[PDB]
Design a protein around this ligand. Structure first.
Ligand code: N8A
Ligand code: ZN
Length: 257
């Protein structure tokens, strides 16, 4: 089974998921001087006021907060998108040290972590159908750097000790994901893929230029999670990121100058 170790990590994934070598894989390095400003791109519309968080889960590859996606409660619209995308979950990728952890890079710079807010296109009715479509998902990616604390992350950090090992979950209601967003919604966008198996080429990526800052204490709590299940040899959940993949026949567009 796939993971992030020497014998099951990203360089092995293509054996079970041959699309790993496909034409629109993620993440990628964002070369800021080569991204082209597109004046036709609209502002992103992030409408999270009615979000209903449900549960937080350690799935053995990250921790995920899930939302009620049975109605248009927390939706992403505008930007490069046509139609309405419902928020299903968010999760993070992070490093063993502050100089690595992000999936996307910016002029080869790696951030300490990366937040993925995962949304699916309501025209396909459910996320399983959306993953089989080239415009099925929109993932809003937000970089994390280490410095000052992010107060809106603290409720997440404080429950992680209850989901230490793979398969554990907890009720996580009334969490407001607006507390995770930076000031600016300036973004880069490109067509890509899921960054974990099945690596489906179904994602419009929207990566925010402005990182959020989190404290060293907050990221240390991420690094105390375990990849293993309870009772198995402890392997800290760190470095759960896929490296940048070939850009191939794609242009990254910027919403800003
Ligand atoms: N990391 S990401 O590109 O935001 C992203 C977003 C939504 C997703 O469903 C995934 N992939 C994911 O959750 N995979 C779960 C594990 C799995 C599911 C199906 C087959 C093999 N492995 C990644
Ligand atoms: Zn992700």
């Amino acid at each position: 089974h796939w993971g992030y170790g020497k014998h099951n990590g990203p360089e092995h994934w293509h054996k079970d998921f041959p699309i790993a070598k496909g034409e629109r894989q993620s993440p990628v390095d964002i070369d800021t001087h080569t991204a082209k400003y597109d004046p036709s791109l609209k502002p992103l519309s992030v409408s999270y006021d009615q979000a209903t968080s449900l549960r937080i889960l350690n799935n053995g590859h990250s921790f995920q907060v899930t939302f009620d996606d049975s109605q248009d409660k927390a939706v992403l619209k505008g930007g490069p998108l046509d139609g309405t995308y419902r928020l299903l979950q968010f999760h993070f990728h992070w490093g063993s040290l502050d100089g690595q952890g992000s999936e996307h890079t910016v002029d080869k710079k790696k951030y300490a972590a990366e937040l993925h807010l995962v949304h699916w296109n309501t025209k396909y009715g459910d996320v399983g159908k959306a993953v089989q479509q080239p415009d099925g998902l929109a993932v809003l990616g937000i970089f994390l750097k280490v410095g000052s604390a992010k107060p809106g992350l603290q409720k997440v950090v404080d429950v992680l000790d209850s989901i230490k090992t793979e398969g554990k979950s907890a009720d996580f209601t009334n969490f407001d994901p607006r507390g995770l967003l930076p000031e600016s919604l300036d973004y880069w966008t490109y067509p890509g893929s899921l960054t974990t198996p099945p690596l489906a080429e179904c994602v419009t990526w929207i990566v925010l230029k402005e990182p959020i800052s989190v404290s060293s204490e907050q990221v240390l709590k991420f690094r105390k999670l375990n990849f293993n299940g309870e009772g198995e040899p402890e392997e800290l959940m760190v470095d759960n990121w896929r490296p940048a993949q070939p850009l191939k026949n794609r242009q990254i567009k910027a919403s800003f100058k």
